[model samples]
Target: PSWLASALACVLIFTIVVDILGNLLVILSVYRNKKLRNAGNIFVVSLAVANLVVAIYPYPLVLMSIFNNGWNFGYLHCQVSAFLMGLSVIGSIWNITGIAIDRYLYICHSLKYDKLYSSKNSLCYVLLIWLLTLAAVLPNLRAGTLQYDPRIYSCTFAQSVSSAYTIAVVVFHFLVPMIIVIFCYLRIWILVLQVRGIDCSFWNESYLTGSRDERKKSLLSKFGMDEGVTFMFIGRFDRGQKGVDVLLKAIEILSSKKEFQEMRFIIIGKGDPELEGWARSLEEKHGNVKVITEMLSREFVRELYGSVDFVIIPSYFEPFGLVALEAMCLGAIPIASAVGGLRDIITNETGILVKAGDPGELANAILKALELSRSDLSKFRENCKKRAMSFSKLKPQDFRNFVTMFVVFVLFAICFAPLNFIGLAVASDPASMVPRIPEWLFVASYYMAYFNSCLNPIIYGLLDQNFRKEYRRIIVSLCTARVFF
Candidate 1:
C-alpha cells in the first residue's frame, strides 16, 4: 500500500537506531562490568560483538540504500558489504548457540559445567567461531560467488552459486546450529521437569549478560506488538469454503509437533453447527487457537488484516476470490489452494498456493511461508500490494486517458519504424540516396520522433485532471510572483 509505504520507511529508520544502540550497550556493559566479565559471559560478549559488526558496518550501508538510494558505491563495495553482512549474521547465530550450550550445561550438569565453561575455554571457542566464519567467507569472495545485486541494490551471496557450496553454508550457518539449539533446549526442558527445586528460577539469571557506560553507549549507538507468526483463516465455514478444513487439519498436524508450538491459529467467521462444533473442540484442546463466531465491523477487519502474516484460503472453487485480493491489499501473503480464481490470484512471488483438499500440502506450504526471511517476506508483501493496486478503483475519464496515451505511443512506434529502414537502405547506396528520400520528408520524420517523446508529459497533464490542476496552479504562482525567494 502507498499508505503503508510511509509506515515501512519509519520502521526501517527506527530499526537502524535501536539495533545499533542496543548491541553497543551490550558490548559496553560486558566490557566494563566486573560481575559480567566471567566464563558464562564470554559468549554473550561475542554475541554482542557480532551484533555490533552489523550495527557499525552493514546497517549504515543499509540505511543509505533505504533512503539515499541503492548501491551508491557500485559493484566492488557491494560484494565487500554483503560479505561483511553474512559474516555478522553467521557469527551472531553461532555465538547464540554457544550460549545455549553453556546454559544447558550450567542447568543440567552444574558441577561439570563449572569446570568445563572456564573463561579461557569460552574465549577460545568465541575466537574459533570468528576464525571459522572468516574462513567460510574468504572462499566465496575469492571464487567471485559474492557480488552486487541490483534487486536488493547491495552486495550479497549470488543465489546462482553451486549447490554444494549453498548446502554447505545452509548446513553450517543455519541447519546444524538450529538442530543443536533445539536438541539442547529439549534436554534442558526435560531436566526442568525432572528436577524438584528448579521452579522456573532460570529466568532471573542473565542468560545472554549487559551498566552506566553501557547505558551511555546504548543512547549513542542506535534501535512491535505484532510479534510471533500468526496464521489466519477468515471466511464462512460452509462446504464449498473448505478453507477452514485445511487450516484446522494443518494446525492439528502442527499441534503434536514440537516445532510449531509457538504458532497461533485464528479462525474468523460463523459456520454450520457440525463445523462450528469441530472448531469448538479445537478451541478446547488448544489455548493457542482462537475462533471468532461473528462477522466483524469494517474497522475491525482492517485492523485484523494489518496484523496477519499469511491468509489461508483453501476453497474447492471460487469464481473470483475477493477475499484473497483483500488480504493481498493489506500486504499479507495468501496461501490459497490451487483451484479456480484463487490460483490466479496467488503465485510463488505474491503468495503460495497448495493442492486443493490436500492437508499435507497445505501444512508444508504454511511451513514454507513461515521460513521466509524478513527481506524476502518484505519483497513478497510489496509485490502483493503492487498487484492489488492495479485493481484499485479508477475514474472513467482517467481510464480513457490512459487508453488514448497507449494508442498514441503504439501508433507512433508503428508509423516511424519505416523511416529508419529507409534511411538505412539509402546509406547502403550513397549515389541513389537523395532521390530515394527528399530532405523535407527526412527532417519531418526525424523531428516527429522528438515530438512523440515531448508529447508524453503534455498529454499526461492534459488528460489527468488533478495533474493539470496542479500544473496550472504552479504556472499562475510563478507568473504572478516577482523575486519570490
Candidate 2:
C-alpha cells in the first residue's frame, strides 16, 4: 500500500510539473510568435489554460492526499479542488468543441470565416465558452455532490447523488459537445472532398443529359458549331516548358489531314510575345481554330472543361498537372504528355498520354481522341471522373499520420475509461463497490487520467510542425540562456 502511494505520488508530481511547464510554454509560444497569434489559436490557448489550472491548483492537493495516504485536506480544500477539476474537465471539452467549429468554419466556409472570426470575435467566443463552463460546474456545489472518496484519496463529484442529474450531465456536458465536434469535422471532410472535384453533381448531370451525341448537340450551338469534336488547350505560351511550339507543329501537321476538318480547336493562353504571334497565326491560317490570348476566369475555364471533348497538355516537363485534374473533374478527357505527375494521373482508360514534345505523336493522340466513337469518348469521360475521385482522399502518407494520431487518442480514452467505469460502479452501489476493485488499481487508473494532461504537449510537439519548431527554439534558448528572467 505504501509503495502504491509512493508510485502514485511520483506520477502526480511528474504530471504536475510537465502540465505546468508545457502549458506555460504553449502560452508563451503563442504570445511571442505572430504566426501562432491567429483566431484558431485562441481556442488552443483556452484549452491550455483549462489543462494548466488543474495542475496548478487541484493536482497539488491531490499529491498531498497521495502522500498522506488519505483525504487529509480540509472540507473547503476538498470542495474547491473538486470544483476546479470539474471546471477544467468541462472547459477542456468545450474548448475542443470550439476548435473543431472554428476549423470547420475556416475551411468549409472560408469566405465567410474572415467576417465571422476576427481576433476580437474569437476572444469573445472563448469568454462565452468559459462562462458556459462555469454555469455547468457551479450547479454541483448547490447539489452537494462534492464528496471525498478514500478509494482515490480525493474529493470529486458523486455521480450517485441523483441518477437523473448524472444522466443529464453526461448527456449535455459530454455527449452533446462530442457530437457537435464530430459533426463539424465530418462536414469539413465532405467539403474537402467536394473541393477536390470528387463531387458527384457533375457526374449526375453528365449522365442526365442522355447520350454524348445529344449532350454535344445541345452544347455545340452555343459555340457556333453544328457538329464537331471540340478540343481545348489552356496554358501559358511558355516556349521552354509548356511545349506550345510542339503543339503548334502538331496542329499544323493535323491541318493537312481529313479528320482535322471535323475537329474544332480552342487555344487559350498568353505568354511569350513570339509564341503568341505563332498562336495568332495558327488561328488566322485555320478555319476551325480559335485562339484566345486573354486570361479567363476559373468559372469560364470550368465551362470550357464541361464543353470540351478533350483537354490537351503538351508539356516538356510538369511537376504536377493541375489542369489535367481540373479537366477530368468536369468530364473532359485529357490528352497529356507522359511526364511527371501527368503520368501518374492519366491512363489508357481515362485519357491518352503521349510522348512529350513529339509533334507527330501529339498530333496522333489528338487524332486518336478525335476518332473515338461518341459512346466510347463518353466512357473515357466517365473513367476520367472516377480516376479524379481517387485523388480526393488523403494521400497515403497523410492517412498513415492520421491513423497514428487516432491511435494515440484511442489510447488516451482507454487510460481514462477504467477510472470512470469504476466511479460509475461505486456511485451506483457504494457498499459493494469498494471491495470489488483493488485500491492500488484505482489509484493507478486515477493517475493515468492525470498523465494525459502532460501527454497533450508531447502530442502537439510530435504532430504539429509549428509547435515542434517553437518547442525546439524554446528548449534551445533555455539551454543556452545565461539568465532566467
Candidate 3:
C-alpha cells in the first residue's frame, strides 16, 4: 500500500534516532562511570558495541529500501551489509549470555567471583564472543549467499541457497546461548531465595551481650516500637523478603515495654532450614510472637486473614504481589512496600504503601494504619475487595504464553516466516526454488530483525541501574559540552 509508506517513513526515522543515540549513550556512560568499569560491566559494554554495529551499519539499508523498493544502493553494498548484520546479531546474543553467566558466578560462586571473573579476563571473553560471531557469519560470506533480502528491504543470509549453514547459524547464535541464559538465571533465582534475614551475618547473642553503646543494632530496625496491635507477615523468610526481618525486629522492640505486653505478632512461612535459629530466638524473646514454618492450606489461609488487623508485605522486589491482593479480598487491610508489581496492587483506599526494603518506614506505616479510625478501616477493606476483583484471572504463565504467540505470528513472521518457507522449499530442490521465491520476502525479514536493534537500550535501562545512571550522566555531559576551545 502506497498510503502506508508514510507510516514506514515515521517508523524509519524513529528507529534511526533511538538506535544511534541509545547505543551511543550506553557506550559513553560505561566509559565515564568508573563505578561501572568492572568485570561484570565488560559484557554490558560489549553488548552495546554489537547493538551499535547493527544500527549504524546494516540498518540504513531499510531506510534506503523504503524509498527505492530494491537495492537502489547496489549488489556489492548489499552483500557487505548482510555479513555485518550476521556479525551483529550473533554478537548481541553471545554478549547477553555472557552477562547471565557473570551474574550466576557472582552470586552462586561468591567465594570465587573475583578469581573466576576479573576485568582483564572478561575482556578476553568479550574478544571470544566476537570471534565466535565472526565464525558463524564467515561461511555465508564465503559462499556469496549473504546478500540483499528485498522482502523486508534489507540484507540477510539467504537461507534458501544453503540450509546447512542456516542450521549452523541458528544453533550457534540462538539455541546454545539461550540454554546458557536460562540455566544461569534459574540458578540465580534459587540463590536469591536461600539468603536469609536483613544481613548475611545474622545477629548473635554475643552482639546482644555488649553495652548499649557497643551493641550492634538489627540491620533493618530502629531502637524502639509501640505495641497493642496484631500484625501478620507472610511469605518465605528469605534475604530478598526483607519485610519479614522488619516485622521480627518490630515485635522485639515492642516486647521491651510492660505496657505493650499484650501485642501479638504473627509470622507465617517457612525458610531455608540450614540457617541459624533466628526465628526461634525471636519467638523466645517475645512470648506474644508466633512463627509458623509449615505451609497452611488455602482454606486455613482464608480464615486466618479474617483474624489479622493488618497484613504486611515489604518485599525487596516483587514480580506481582498477589499475596497482598488475596489478603485484601479476604478483608485484611494491607501495608505493602512500593516495589515492582506491588505498587500497582496497593492503593490509598485499599492499603498503606511504604518505601521498599526500608524497615523503619514499614514499621512506622504499621503504626499509622493502627491509628486510623474504624470508619476508614471498613472503607479500606470494602475498597480492597472491590479492587482485588479488578485483576484478571490470568496467571503470569498465561501472559508468557501470549507473548510467545505474538513473537511467532508477528515478529517471527517478518523475520523468518516467508524465508523459512522458501528455505524449506529450496532444501527439497535448491535449483528450482531460488528464482521462484520473491525478493520482497527476504527484504522484509531482514529489516524486521534490524528494526529490533532499537530495543537494546530499553532493556539496559530497565535491568541495569549502573548503566541507566551512567547513561543519564553521559547524555547530560554531551548536551552541555559546548565548543572545547
Candidate 4:
C-alpha cells in the first residue's frame, strides 16, 4: 500500500477533498434518511465507509508512482501513503468480508438468524473492523521505509534485508488475508450444507419452522410490508384493545369448565402503562386474573418472583426477552411471542410460543399451559430457571454497575485523597508537598474525567428525552450559524 513520491502529493490532495465530501454524505444519509436505515442498507451505508477512506487517501495512486520507477516526492510521503494505504486496502477487504458474512448469515443461515445486524450492533462491528485494520497495518510504522537510487530518482524498498521487507509486504497485503477469507467462507459453506435441511422451511414450510425469509414474507404479507413501526399506537384505543382482548380470553378459558385447574394467571411484572392498562382491564374482566404490579421495585422485583404461576411477555417485538427470563428464574412458565431475541430465550422445556397479533393462539396456549400440575410445571420451571442466566440483563451474578462505581471511587481517592495526605505530608515537610501540588493538582483533575464516564451515561439516559429535543434544535440552529460564517 505504500506509494511512490511525486504521485503521493497529488493523490493526497485529491483524497482530502474527496474524503470530506464522502464522509459528510455518509453521515447525512445514515442519520437523516430513514430509508437508509433498513437491514441490508445498514451494510450498504457501512460499505460507504470504504469509499470514504479511498477518497481520504489514494495510496493506490502513490503506489502507481512507485511502480513507474521513481521516488518522485522523496521518501516522506512514500512511507506515509504506503502505510496508510496498507490499512486502507485491509480495511476495504474486511468491510467487503463483513458485508459478505452478513449476507451469508441472512441468506444461507436463515433458520439460526438473529436481527443482531441492527444499527447499534452493526456500528459496533464497523468500529471493530476499523480497529482491526489499525492492528493489521501497525508493523509498517515500525518497519521503516527510506529509499534512494544512484540517480536520486529511482528506487525500491530501502530496508537492509529487502527480502524481509518484500515478504512482510506480500504477507501483510495478500497471503495472510487471502488464506483467512478462504477458510472462513469454507466453514460457512460447510455449515450451510449442514443446515440446508431446514432452509426450505424458512422459505417454504408455512408455520412450524421459523426461517427468516418465510417469517419475513409472512409478517410482511399479514402486517403490511411497511408495518410503519408500532413505536406508538395511533390506530385508536378500541383497535389496540383487540390485542389486549386476547389476554382476557386466556383468563376466561382458565377460569371454568371441567378443566377445574388452579387457573392462576400469575403475572410477574412491574407496571408500565400497557401493563397497568392490561391489569386493570383483565382484573375487572376476570376475577381469577391475579395482579402483582408492585414487582417494579428492583429489590422487590428480584426477591418476589417465585409465587407466579406463569410468565407472559406482552411485548410487541420483545428484543432481548429479559423479563421472560426473570419469570423463568422464579420457576414461572414463560409464554412469549416469536420475535427478536425472544427467539433465543424460549426453549421446549422452559416455555411455549404463540405468534404476535393473534389473541386466539395466545388464549389456546394459555389454556394448554394451565394443564400442567404443580410438579410438572415446577420441573419445567426449573429448566427455565437454569437457562435463565443466559439472558444478559437477568443474570443473578452480574455486578457491572457496582464494580464500575467501586473502581472509580477507589482510584479517585488514591489520586485526590492525596490532598489530605499532602497536607499531612506538608505539615511534616511543607516544601515537599508544595513542590508536588502542581503536578498533583493536574493528576487529581485527570481523575475527575472518569466521573464523567460513569455520570455522563446516567445523565444522558436520564435527560435523553430533553437532551434529544435540544440536540435537534441545535441541528436546526446550524442555519442560524451559517449566516455568521
| Index of the highest-TM-score prediction | 2
List model 2 lDDT by residue over 288-400, tens digit each: 78888878986667667776788899998875677787889878989999985677567778889899979999998888788788678778878887766655532322322
lDDT of 4 by residue, 1-485 (tens): 23334543444455446445434444454565454445554544554555455444443444354456555564566566555544654665566556545544543333323334343477678888888878866765575543433221222233232345544544554455455545544544443333221222121112234532343345334422231111000111232422344454555654565442334343433424764586667667654454554425544443334433555654565445455655565555667777655565577767888887676677677667766664686578567756543332222322232233233223423432333333334344444544555653533432232122222223221333433344355457665654453
For each candidate in turn, the TM-score is 0.38, 0.57, 0.51, 0.36
How badly does each model clash, as a count of residue pairs? 6, 0, 11, 6
lDDT of each residue in 142-210, candidate 1, tens digit only: 777787544333466653444456556755666677678666655554433333221122211112123
Query: What TM-score should be assigned to candidate 3?
Result: 0.51
Q: What's the true lDDT of residue 312 in model 3?
A: 84
Clashing pairs in 4: 1-82, 2-82, 5-73, 6-72, 6-73, 202-211
The alpha-carbon deviation from the true structure for residue 132 of candidate 2, after best TM-score superposition, in angstroms, is 1.0
Best by lDDT: 2
Taking all chains together, the TM-score of candidate 2 against the true structure is: 0.57
lDDT of each: 0.60, 0.75, 0.63, 0.46
Best of the two (1, 4) by lDDT: 1
**Which of candidates 2 and 4 reaches a greater lDDT?**
2
